[PDB]
Amino acid sequence: AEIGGDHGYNATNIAAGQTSGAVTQIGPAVMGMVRRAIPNLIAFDICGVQP
């Protein structure tokens, strides 16, 4: 009669793996990284260039 438990849903426990149950998981897997998008240039046609 053994309990698997849940993390407290506290973001502190879930990241450490603390668990009320029998097992403390290694950690929170990974779902991948979310970067921030690189915003766009307006290019230079709007103004004469002349390198």
Binding site: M33, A37, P39, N40, L41, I42, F44, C47, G48, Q50
Partner: protein
């Protein structure tokens, strides 16, 4: 100035390259700023539009707001109303051709808001119409350049815009006929190093570009001063005095 103990962490845990990420955000930042510069020397150096000869005599002198029956020409509902902008964006593109003596206003830049007001209305000569924004790219992710109006203007969004507006510019066929000159010199030459005491790397980029104002731009003066005259933009020569660039705030969208 990224730590030497970071890269090893970030190579192992995230697989990302550390260095090549900072060289990612520095090389992008400078080319975003150098690009945010010229757009900010266009909106800085552009005359106030819908003023002087382009006023509807009872207008608000420098703002076009869809809630004035004088500015929208007594238009009613939407198709009539937005089509009164397309006449206001004409009237200045016509009026650059008076002050420059090069051509009709050849492009505009503008906020996300008004490019809907441009993209949602039939831009030809037809009745009164509205609907889903179609002909233009209203978002800025794909690219900022959004469509062309009637095969004439070319409408670049300004993705960072504080109130709202459209700046009707000019770009001649030549690289010479502009109204402002973005002339690069060196491009983002990377530089590397390491802090000699603690052994930890630093990196940085340098560029040199320089800008120029079109002689004849001020358009109000028959003579230059001093005959050798700095062309770098300043308050005296380049502020609000370009003929090539005319700017109008739009309200009530």
């Amino acid at each position: 100035a990224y730590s030497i103990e970071l890269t090893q962490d970030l190579r192992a845990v995230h697989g990302m390259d550390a260095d090549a990420e900072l060289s990612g955000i520095l090389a992008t930042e400078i080319m975003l700023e150098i690009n945010r510069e010229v757009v900010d020397w266009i909106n800085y150096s552009a005359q106030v539009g819908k003023s002087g000869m382009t006023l509807t005599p009872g207008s608000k002198a420098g703002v076009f707001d869809f809630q004035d029956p004088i500015d929208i020409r007594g238009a009613r509902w939407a198709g009539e109303s937005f089509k009164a902008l397309l006449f206001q964006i004409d009237k200045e593109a016509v009026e650059i051709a008076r002050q420059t003596g090069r051509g009709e206003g050849n492009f505009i830049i503008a906020s996300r808001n008004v490019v809907n007001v441009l993209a949602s209305v039939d831009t030809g000569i037809s009745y009164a119409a509205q609907g889903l924004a179609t002909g233009f790219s209203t978002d800025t992710t794909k690219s900022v350049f959004a469509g062309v109006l009637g095969g004439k203007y070319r409408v670049y969004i300004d993705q960072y815009a504080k109130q709202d507006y459209f700046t009707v510019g000019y770009k001649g066929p030549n690289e010479m006929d502009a109204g402002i000159y973005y002339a690069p010199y060196v491009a983002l030459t990377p530089l590397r190093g390491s802090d000699p005491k603690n052994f930890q790397p630093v990196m940085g980029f340098k560029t040199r570009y320089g800008i120029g104002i079109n002689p004849f731009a001020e358009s109000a003066a028959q003579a230059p001063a001093s005959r050798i005259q700095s062309g770098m933009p300043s308050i005296l020569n380049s502020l609000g005095k370009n003929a090539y660039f005319r700017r109008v705030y739009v309200k009530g969208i």
